[PDB]
């Protein structure tokens, strides 16, 4: 029932081209959220300061 409710309604806003509705936004790739702050493995004694 839920997958059909979403399919029926996803189509309703798809075929309505002009109006704007917020869609799901996902990150570009498998990367950390801030490359200027931290990496993938994080040191227990600190990044910049002890």
């Amino acid at each position: 029932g839920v997958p059909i409710s979403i399919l029926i309604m996803v189509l309703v806003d798809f075929f309505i081209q002009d109006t704007y509705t917020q869609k799901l936004s996902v990150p570009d790739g498998f990367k950390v959220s801030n490359s200027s702050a931290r990496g993938w493995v994080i040191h227990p004694l600190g990044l910049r300061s002890e």
Binding site: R38, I42, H43, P44, L45, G46, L47, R48, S49
Partner: protein, 51 residues
């Protein structure tokens, strides 16, 4: 109990808010402190499961 879905929640968000508001005030590292809230949580869970 595989039917449980494990994910982020509101109270966890509030705790992370408090942790950032504490690490920014004290000039501490927000994520390294989390690496110690986890190293202590492993102790806590092992002791609780043991007894």
């Amino acid at each position: 109990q595989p039917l449980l879905v494990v994910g982020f929640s509101g109270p966890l968000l509030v705790f992370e808010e408090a942790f950032f508001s504490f690490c920014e005030t004290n000039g501490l590292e927000y994520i390294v402190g989390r690496v110690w809230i986890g190293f202590w949580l492993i102790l806590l869970v092992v002791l609780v499961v043991a007894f």
